[PDB]
Amino acid sequence: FRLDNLGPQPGSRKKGKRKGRGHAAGQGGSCGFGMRGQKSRSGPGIMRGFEGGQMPLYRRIPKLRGIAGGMRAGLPKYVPINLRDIEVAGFKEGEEVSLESLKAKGIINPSGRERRLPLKILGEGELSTKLQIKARAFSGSAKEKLEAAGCSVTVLPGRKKYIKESVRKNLARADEY
Amino acid sequence: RVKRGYIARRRRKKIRFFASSFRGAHSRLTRTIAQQKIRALVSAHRDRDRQKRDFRRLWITRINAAIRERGVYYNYSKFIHDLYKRQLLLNRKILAQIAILNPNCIYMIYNEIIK
């Protein structure tokens, strides 16, 4: 390939249409904006969502519930991982399953929250190959799948909350068998 | 990135050269040179369709005036009566041309339309 003979494929770069350059070009005269109104005048024009003096679409509808109250919205607290992410993976019979394994394998790519939401293994899909999972807690159906596969299942306690000594005393008093 | 040009003067000089013999400011003055180019071309349109129509009219009245020289009441309509009954497919009113370029031959035309 020389510097001469290079050319783009057709359809790759259309020409930008220029407006007000002749009526044979297509958008001459009023440049494709009719005759008058706010659509033809120059400026910000119309707010998108404005109904022309009518009370708008969004104001006539009541607010969504926790967003109406200002309550903090529903937020994912784990990484949802099915067993379909585990069978299609190249994990063989002897292999650990943890955070850095699923990151370094190419299943999860967590960036915005590396610190808060650990992991969770869910139920849909099967898992025939046995493994040794030391990750965070499970669903009941995924516990039925993993204990149905005969694999080493280990839940990992992540963090310990601070309990006040009178609350820890009142809870330790409740050990009445 | 200034873009002063010359293409309006060739664009305009072609239209300037077409507008010769327009008698005054229709042949010199640009802002009328344009609309005389325009009106001259549509004049060419309607005078072309009506030169078809107009030469049709001219040959009709010319062969009518040729046939009416017999004196006896033989019109132009009767020449077409006995011009299509005696099977002469479509002489196309060019007998109005050889009616003056060959008047004895159009006398042979009409004198064989009679028989």
Binding site: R48, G49, L57, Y58, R59, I61, P62, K63, I67, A68 | -
Partner: protein, 69 residues
């Protein structure tokens, strides 16, 4: 540079549902409820799709929420 701002007065009213369609809460519920019917008060208690006109109006007025069509 200048990021587009999410319109908050419609972000509190509209919502995406996984497949990618705008849903909304029906109107006429927090006012004069004895006057209505229980049939009306559970007809007006559910969240429905918004119709295509105002499904294509506010789709450009609320840019960062991943709605197809």
């Amino acid at each position: 540079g200048y990021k587009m701002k999410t319109h908050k007065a419609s972000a509190k009213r509209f919502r995406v549902t996984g497949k990618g369609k705008i849903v909304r809460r029906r109107a006429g519920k927090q006012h004069l409820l004895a006057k209505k019917n229980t049939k009306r008060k559970n007809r007006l208690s559910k969240l429905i799709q918004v119709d295509r006109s105002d499904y294509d109006n506010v789709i450009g007025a609320l840019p960062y929420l991943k709605v197809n069509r």
